[PDB]
C-alpha cells in the first residue's frame, strides 16, 4: 500500500527526453 512506483522497471518505456534538449541534441535547434 505504501509502494513508490519505480518508473525504470521492466514494464515502463524509456524516459521521455525534454523536447528542447532532444532537438538541440539532434542538432536542429541552435542555442
Amino acid at each position: 500500500p505504501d509502494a513508490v512506483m519505480d518508473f525504470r522497471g521492466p514494464d515502463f518505456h524509456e524516459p521521455t527526453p525534454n523536447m528542447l534538449s532532444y532537438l538541440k541534441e539532434n542538432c536542429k535547434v541552435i542555442s
Binding site: 500500500p1 512506483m5 518508473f7 515502463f12 523536447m19
Partner: protein, 961 residues
C-alpha cells in the same frame, strides 16, 4: 511499443519531431523566387542554411507573462540588384515557430493548447453502387485527391459516362479525356469495351474531339456553364488548372498508392498527379463493376481513412504562411522599385506572416483546443482524441469501441487505443504477436498491422490451455478473419492478440473488473473519471487495474529526475539533486490554479541522501500518490435502502466524511481587470473611491488593490478603479468567499503613450463535501449526496464501525454493472490485509469465475488473519448482518459491505394550456414580442392591424400596436 505500453504522448512527440526534422524543408522549398515586372530585382531564399533558435524565455515565463513559447526561424536570403550587380546576403528573420512541450502541449498567449487528431477519407478511387428511384442498380466511382477534391464518375440510364464535378455540372468522359492529350484512337483500343464508347459518339462531339485545343474549349464550356464560345489562351488554362486540376487531380503519394493498388496498375510511386490512364482505368472497372466483376468499397473501413496529426496541421500553417510572405515581399519589392531605393532584404520581410499565422491557427482552428487540466487524467487523454457513428471491425486495437461522446457528436469523436500507432501513410497500426513456422529467423515476433493487412490474417484472442486425447494444434479457438468471427484450429492461426489493454482507451482501462460491467456503463465511467476533483489529501485505490502508474508517468504532473545522482536538500519549494559534478535545482509547484480552477501542488517524494536514477519520481503532484493516479478515496460502504434518502441515485453519507476532511478540495479562482483609455481620459486605480463605505475598502492597500492574505467576502472590492468619475471596481461576485493567495500587477509594454494595466487576484476556497455534491465510483455508479447523518445514526458493522456511505442496491440490476460488487468486497479485504491489488482486465481468460475466486479467497484470508468472521460468511460470502444505528436492532437480511474507491466530481406552454391556467400563461409570457413583429413585417411592405369590434355598438377600434 513492442514489449511495453508506449508513452501516451508518443504520437504528439513523434509528429512534432517530423515537422521540425522534415516538415520545415518541404514547405521552405515551395517558396517561389520573387521577380518584379521589369525583372531587374530578384529575391530568393537560401533554404539549406535555415536555422532554429532556442526560445529566449522559459515555459513558466511564457505562462506568467502571457507570452508564447516559440523559436526563431532564420534563413539566409540573397538580393541581386542587376543595376549594380551586387549580391547582398544577410541572415533574415522569417518569424516565430511555436514549440511543443514533451507533454505534447503548446503555450500560445499563456494558454495551454493541444492539437487533436483528425480522421479523414484517404485519396483514392472508391466504387459505390446506389439504387435509383426505380430500384435499378447504378454504379458510381469517385476519385479523391490529396486536397479532398472529388472527380466523380457515374453510369446513367443510357450508359453515358458523366464527370460530375458538382450537383449541376456534368461533363462527358470523351471530352475530358481528349482535353488531356488522349486521342480518340488509343481510348478505344485500351478499353475492354470499345463498342460501348463508340456508341455514344455524336457527330458534333467527334469534330471537337479531333483536336486537343478544341476539346479544351469544349471542356471549359461544360465545366463553367458559361454561354458562349471561349477562345483558347494561356490564361484560360492557368485559371482552369488552379480551379480544377490543382484542387482535384493532385493525388499525392497516398492517393497514387491507393489508385495503383485498387486499379491494379504498375505506375511508379513518384507520380503524384493524375494520369489519363488512371481516369481511363476508372472507366473500365466501372463497366466491369456493373457486370459483377469485383466488390464495392466500404467507406467506413479504416484502410480507406487517414489520420492527420499535429505534423500535418503545423506543416499546412507553414505552407499557408509562406504563401503570404511571398506576396508581402511582392508588395514591398514594388514599393522600393517605385522609389528607386535599395531595399535591405530585411525591410522586405516582416515577421507577422509567420507569427500571426500561428496565433490565429491556435486561437481559431477547431482542432486546436484549450487543454483540460481538471486532473492528471484529463491532461493525458485530451491529446489522444480523434475527431471525424458505428463501430467497424477495422477499429479493433486502433480506435476504442467504448470511449465516445454523449449527445449529438456520439461516434464522431473517439479515442486512440492504448497500443495504437500512426503508420507511414497516415494509417493506424496495432501490434500483434506472430506465430511463425519452424524454419524462419523471426527476430522480433511483434509486428504492427495496418487496417488493410488485418482482414487477411487469422487473429485469435484465446489461449492454449486445452488438451484432449488428440494434439494441442487441433484445439479450436475463436478468431477474427475477413471482418467476421470463426472457430479454427490453433495451427491455422496466424497472429495472437496478447496485450491486456490492447482494445480500449485510457479511461476504459482504469475500470477494474470491467468485464463484469455492461459496456454502456463503461462509457459513462470514462466521462466521470474526467470530472473528478483532485483532493487536498490524496490516496491510492486499494483495487486498480495497474494502468494508474502509466497515467502518472505520462501526465507530467509529478516531478521526474532528468539526471541520476543523489538528493541533498528538499523543502516545500525545491529539491536539490547532484550527480557527476552537476547540481540541479528543481522548483516545486505550489497552490497553482489550473484551467478549471483546480489546485495543483507538488510534494517531495524523496529525502536527503537518496540515490536516484534518471527518469525516477521525485515529487507527487495533485491526485497522485507514489507515482500512481489517485482520483478518490476508499470509504466504508453498505448497499441497502435507507428511508428513501438514497432513492434512485441519491447517496446517504456520514458526517465523518465532512469533519474528517475526506473529500475536501482546494479551488483557486482568478479575478482579473484591465485599464482602458476612454474618450474622456484613462481609467485609474485608486483606493479613494467616492460614495463608498469604508467597510468595503478595508481590504484595499494604498494603491487600491486588495491586500495579500486577506479574507474577502461577497461585495468586497478587490481592485478600486475609476472611469472618467464612475465606479468600475472589481467586486467579488456571489459565492466567492475565500483567501487572497496571490496578487499580480503589470503594464503591457506597448508602443502607445498609455500602456494598459492588468491586475489579477487569486482567491483560494477550501470546499468540504456537501448535500448536492456528486460522487461516483469507477463503474458508472454516479450519485448525488442527499443527506448527511451523525455517525451514531449510520448503520454499523459487527466490529462496531459505522459505514461512511449508503448506496441504493436497486441501482445495480437495472444498470448491470456488477463490477462494483467485486471491487467493494476486494477493497475491504485489502484494507484489512494491508494489501493493494492491480488486476488486468478479463481475468476469466485464466479460468472460469476467476474474479469470484480471487475475491472470495482474499475475503476469507482477511477474515482468518484478522479474526473477523463477519468479513467472510460461508452462508452468504461478501455479505454480513449489520445494525441500525438508531435502534441497535439488526437489519433482517445480510448486506453487502465494502471499501470501494469513490471520487468527487466537479412544451411548457402546452402543459399550461392543458391545465386551462390562462392567467398563469399570460403572466409567464408578459406586448414587446408582438410590437417588434409588426415592425419587421413593415420592413416587407406588409401591415398587421389589430381591430376590436365592440359587441355593444359594433364600433371598430384600432389598437395601438
Amino acid at each position: 511499443g513492442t514489449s511495453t505500453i508506449p508513452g501516451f504522448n508518443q504520437i504528439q512527440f513523434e509528429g512534432f519531431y517530423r515537422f521540425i526534422d522534415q516538415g520545415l524543408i518541404e514547405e521552405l522549398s515551395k517558396f517561389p523566387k520573387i521577380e518584379d515586372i521589369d525583372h531587374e530585382i530578384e529575391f530568393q531564399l537560401f533554404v539549406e542554411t535555415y536555422q532554429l533558435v532556442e526560445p529566449l524565455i522559459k515555459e513558466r515565463d511564457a505562462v506568467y507573462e502571457s507570452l508564447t513559447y516559440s523559436s526563431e526561424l532564420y534563413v539566409s536570403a540573397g538580393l541581386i540588384w542587376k543595376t549594380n550587380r551586387n549580391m547582398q546576403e544577410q541572415r533574415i528573420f522569417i518569424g516565430n515557430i511555436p514549440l511543443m512541450n514533451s507533454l505534447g502541449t503548446f503555450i500560445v498567449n499563456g494558454i495551454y493548447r493541444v492539437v487533436i487528431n483528425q480522421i479523414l477519407q484517404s485519396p483514392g478511387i472508391y466504387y459505390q453502387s446506389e439504387l435509383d428511384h426505380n430500384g435499378i442498380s447504378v454504379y458510381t466511382g469517385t476519385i479523391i485527391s490529396d486536397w479532398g477534391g472529388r472527380l466523380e464518375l457515374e453510369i446513367d440510364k443510357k450508359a453515358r459516362i458523366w464527370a460530375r464535378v458538382s450537383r449541376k455540372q456534368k461533363i462527358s468522359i470523351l471530352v475530358l479525356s481528349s482535353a488531356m492529350g488522349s486521342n480518340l484512337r488509343e481510348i478505344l483500343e485500351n478499353v475492354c469495351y470499345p463498342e460501348i464508347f463508340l456508341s455514344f459518339l455524336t457527330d458534333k462531339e467527334k469534330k471537337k474531339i479531333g483536336s486537343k485545343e478544341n476539346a479544351i474549349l469544349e471542356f471549359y464550356q461544360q465545366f463553367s456553364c458559361v454561354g458562349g464560345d471561349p477562345i483558347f489562351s494561356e490564361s484560360l488554362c492557368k485559371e482552369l488548372q488552379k480551379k480544377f486540376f490543382h484542387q482535384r487531380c493532385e493525388l499525392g503519394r497516398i492517393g497514387r498508392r491507393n489508385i495503383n493498388w485498387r486499379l491494379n496498375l504498375n505506375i511508379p510511386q513518384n507520380n503524384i498527379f493524375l494520369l489519363p490512364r488512371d481516369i481511363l482505368a476508372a472507366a473500365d472497372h466501372l463497366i466491369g463493376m456493373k457486370f459483377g466483376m469485383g466488390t464495392l468499397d466500404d467507406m467506413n473501413h479504416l484502410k480507406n481513412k487517414r489520420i492527420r496529426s499535429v505534423a500535418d496541421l503545423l506543416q499546412d500553417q507553414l505552407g499557408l504562411a509562406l504563401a503570404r510572405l511571398e506576396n508581402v515581399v511582392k508588395g514591398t519589392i514594388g514599393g522600393a522599385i517605385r522609389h528607386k531605393l535599395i531595399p535591405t532584404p530585411q525591410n522586405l520581410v516582416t515577421s507577422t506572416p509567420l507569427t500571426t499565422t500561428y496565433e490565429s491557427f491556435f486561437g481559431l482552428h477547431p482542432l486546436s483546443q484549450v487543454l483540460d487540466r481538471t486532473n492528471p487524467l484529463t491532461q493525458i487523454v485530451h491529446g489522444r482524441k480523434l475527431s471525424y457513428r458505428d463501430i467497424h471491425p477495422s477499429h479493433y486495437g486502433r480506435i476504442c469501441p467504448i470511449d465516445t461522446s454523449e449527445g449529438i457528436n456520439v461516434g464522431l469523436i473517439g479515442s486512440l487505443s492504448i497500443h495504437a500507432r500512426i503508420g507511414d501513410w497516415g494509417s493506424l497500426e496495432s501490434p500483434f504477436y506472430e506465430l511463425v513456422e519452424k524454419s524462419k529467423k523471426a527476430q522480433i515476433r511483434m509486428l504492427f498491422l495496418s487496417p488493410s493487412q488485418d482482414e487477411y490474417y487469422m487473429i485469435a484472442a484465446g489461449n492454449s490451455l486445452a488438451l484432449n486425447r488428440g494434439i494441442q494444434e487441433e484445439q479450436v479457438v475463436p478468431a477474427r478473419y475477413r471482418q467476421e468471427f470463426l472457430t479454427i484450429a490453433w495451427e491455422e492461426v496466424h497472429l495472437r492478440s496478447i496485450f491486456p489493454f490492447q482494445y480500449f482507451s485510457i479511461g476504459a482501462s482504469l475500470i477494474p473488473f470491467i468485464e463484469h460491467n455492461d459496456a454502456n456503463r463503461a462509457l459513462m465511467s470514462s466521462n466521470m473519471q474526467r470530472q473528478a476533483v483532485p483532493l487536498s489529501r490524496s490516496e491510492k485505490c486499494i483495487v486498480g487495474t495497474g494502468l494508474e502508474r502509466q497515467v502518472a508517468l505520462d501526465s507530467g504532473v509529478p516531478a521526474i529526475a532528468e539526471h541520476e545522482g543523489k538528493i541533498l536538500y528538499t523543502d516545500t519549494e525545491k529539491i536539490i539533486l547532484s550527480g557527476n559534478e552537476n547540481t540541479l535545482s528543481i522548483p516545486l509547484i505550489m497552490y497553482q490554479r489550473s484551467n478549471k480552477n483546480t489546485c495543483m501542488h507538488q510534494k517531495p517524494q524523496v529525502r536527503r541522501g537518496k540515490c536516484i536514477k534518471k527518469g525516477q519520481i521525485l515529487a507527487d503532484g495533485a491526485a497522485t500518490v507514489g507515482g500512481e493516479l489517485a482520483l478518490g478515496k476508499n470509504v466504508l460502504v453498505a448497499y441497502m435502502p435507507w428511508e428513501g434518502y438514497n432513492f434512485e441515485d441519491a447517496v446517504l453519507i456520514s458526517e465523518c466524511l465532512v469533519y474528517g476532511d475526506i473529500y475536501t478540495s482546494f479551488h483557486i479562482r482568478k479575478y482579473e481587470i484591465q485599464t482602458h483609455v476612454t474618450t474622456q481620459g484613462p481609467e485609474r486605480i485608486t483606493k479613494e473611491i467616492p460614495h463608498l463605505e469604508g467597510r468595503l475598502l478595508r481590504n484595499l492597500d494604498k494603491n487600491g488593490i486588495v491586500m495579500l492574505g486577506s479574507w474577502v467576502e461577497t461585495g468586497d472590492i478587490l481592485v478600486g478603479k475609476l472611469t472618467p468619475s464612475k465606479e468600475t471596481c472589481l467586486k467579488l461576485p456571489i459565492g466567492g468567499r475565500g483567501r487572497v493567495i496571490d496578487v499580480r500587477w503589470v503594464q503591457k509594454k506597448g508602443g502607445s503613450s498609455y500602456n494598459p494595466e492588468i491586475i489579477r487576484v487569486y482567491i483560494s476556497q477550501k470546499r468540504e463535501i456537501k448535500v448536492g455534491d456528486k460522487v461516483a465510483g469507477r463503474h458508472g455508479n454516479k450519485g448525488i449526496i442527499s443527506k448527511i447523518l451523525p455517525r451514531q445514526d449510520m448503520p454499523y458493522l459487527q466490529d462496531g464501525r459505522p459505514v461512511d456511505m449508503v448506496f441504493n442496491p436497486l441501482g445495480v440490476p437495472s444498470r448491470m454493472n456488477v463490477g462494483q460488487i467485486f471491487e467493494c468486497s476486494l477493497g475491504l479485504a485489502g484494507s484489512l490485509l494491508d494489501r493493494h491489488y492491480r488486476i488486468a482486465p478479463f481475468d476469466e481468460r485464466y479460468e472460469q469465475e476467476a474474479s469470484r475466486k480471487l475475491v472470495f479467497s482474499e475475503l476469507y484470508e482477511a477474515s482468518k488473519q484478522t479474526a473477523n468472521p463477519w468479513v467472510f460468511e460461508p452462508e452468504y460470502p461478501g455479505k454480513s448482518r449489520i445494525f441500525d444505528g438508531r435502534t441497535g436492532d439488526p437489519f433482517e437480511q445480510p448486506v453487502i459491505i465494502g471499501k470501494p474507491y469513490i471520487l468527487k466530481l466537479i412544451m411548457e406552454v402546452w402543459a399550461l394550456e392543458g391545465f386551462g391556467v390562462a392567467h398563469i400563461l399570460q403572466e409567464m409570457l408578459t406586448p414587446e414580442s408582438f410590437r417588434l413583429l409588426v415592425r419587421e413585417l413593415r420592413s416587407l411592405a406588409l401591415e398587421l392591424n389589430h381591430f376590436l369590434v365592440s359587441e355593444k355598438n359594433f364600433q371598430i377600434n384600432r389598437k395601438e400596436v
